[PDB]
Amino acid sequence: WGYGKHNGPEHWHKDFPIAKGERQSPVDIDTHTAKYDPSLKPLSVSYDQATSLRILNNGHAFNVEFDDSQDKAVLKGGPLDGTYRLIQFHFHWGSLDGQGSEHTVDKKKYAAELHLVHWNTKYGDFGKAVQQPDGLAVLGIFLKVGSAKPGLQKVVDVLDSIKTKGKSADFTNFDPRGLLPESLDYWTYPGSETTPPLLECVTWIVLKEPISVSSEQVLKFRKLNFNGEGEPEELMVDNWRPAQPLKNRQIKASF
Ligand SMILES: CC(=O)Nc1nnc(S(N)(=O)=O)s1
Ligand SMILES: [Hg+2]
Ligand SMILES: [Zn+2]
């Protein structure tokens, strides 16, 4: 599976038939059919005791991994019942600045999208959590191209260390708070992981307020490679899944 002509999203259904299931992500957020629900609590993002461990290029994107052995960085509040542990975060980006996001907002596509993944602590570990309809919660953040994001620069600089598939680099003392927008106003809906196994286990929480990063900061994203070392060069660009049919679902807004 990958994002190419022969192994791209329009083919993942053959090994992963859940690709055309019931609650698949991403989706277009139509802001006028989004149901403002005033029973939706504010988000409680507690990320001040976060331990980042490392960064690694896994062939389809890079993941800053975190130590989820204790509630150090947790997400609760909003639509969530219970505490969800931060395990890792990654982006999806495009080859140009008019594509990149997975989720769109009135069919508009932004330059990229940050996903901070969290698993429900009721289930003991991430592994058991994806056996559950409420196992995961992914906080989604849109990136637009403008002024540079200060807090994004440590990530951008490490990317030469992990140019190719399989590479890693110790990456401690990274504080994820530096990537959060000013406002925690979100849209939320039942969905899925957007990369195989496409498990229908995610409560998505997409923020309304994009962060901006600079054009030179996102250029560095597009230098990475899909391919392993000593293999033909495949630039890691456009690693996003097209929007899926909302099928029944209604998207709520906290605003
Ligand atoms: C281990 C892990 O995190 N797997 C994920 N699969 N898809 C994710 S995504 N596309 O929803 O943000 S996270
Ligand atoms: Hg599930
Ligand atoms: Zn993702």
UniProtKB/Swiss-Prot annotation:
Matches recorded under PROSITE patterns: ALPHA_CA_1, ALPHA_CA_2
Mutation: N58L; reported impact is:
Reduced activity
Catalytic site positions: H60 (proton donor/acceptor)
Residues annotated for Zn(2+) binding in this entry: H90, H92, H115
Q: Which UniProt keywords apply?
A: Acetylation, Cell membrane, Cytoplasm, Disease variant, Lyase, Membrane, Metal-binding, Osteopetrosis, Phosphoprotein, Zinc
Q: How is its activity regulated?
A: Activated by X-ray, histamine, L-adrenaline, L- and D-phenylalanine, L- and D-histidine, L-His-OMe and beta-Ala-His (carnosine).
Q: What is the effect of changing Y3F?
A: Enhanced activity
**Which reaction is recorded as catalysed by this protein?**
hydrogencarbonate + H(+) = CO2 + H2O; urea = cyanamide + H2O
Outcome of mutating K14E? In Jogjakarta
Q: Where are the Phosphoserine residues found in this chain?
A: S161, S168
MF GO annotations: arylesterase activity; carbonate dehydratase activity; cyanamide hydratase activity; zinc ion binding
Q: What is its main location?
A: cytoplasm
Binding-site residues, substrate: T194, T195
Where in the cell?
Cytoplasm; Cell membrane
Result of changing V138H = Impaired activity
The observed outcome of changing G140R is: In OPTB3; complete loss of activity
* Domain Alpha-carbonic anhydrase, chain residue ranges per copy: 1-255
- Additional detail: Target of drugs used in treatments against glaucoma disorder and breast cancer.
Q: Subunit structure, briefly?
A: Interacts with SLC4A4. Interaction with SLC4A7 regulates SLC4A7 transporter activity. Interacts with SLC26A6 isoform 4 (via C-terminus cytoplasmic domain).
* Illness: Osteopetrosis, autosomal recessive 3: A rare genetic disease characterized by abnormally dense bone, due to defective resorption of immature bone. Osteopetrosis occurs in two forms: a severe autosomal recessive form occurring in utero, infancy, or childhood, and a benign autosomal dominant form occurring in adolescence or adulthood. Recessive osteopetrosis commonly manifests in early infancy with macrocephaly, feeding difficulties, evolving blindness and deafness, bone marrow failure, severe anemia, and hepatosplenomegaly.
Q: Give the UniProt family note.
A: Belongs to the alpha-carbonic anhydrase family.
Q: What is this protein called?
A: Carbonic anhydrase 2
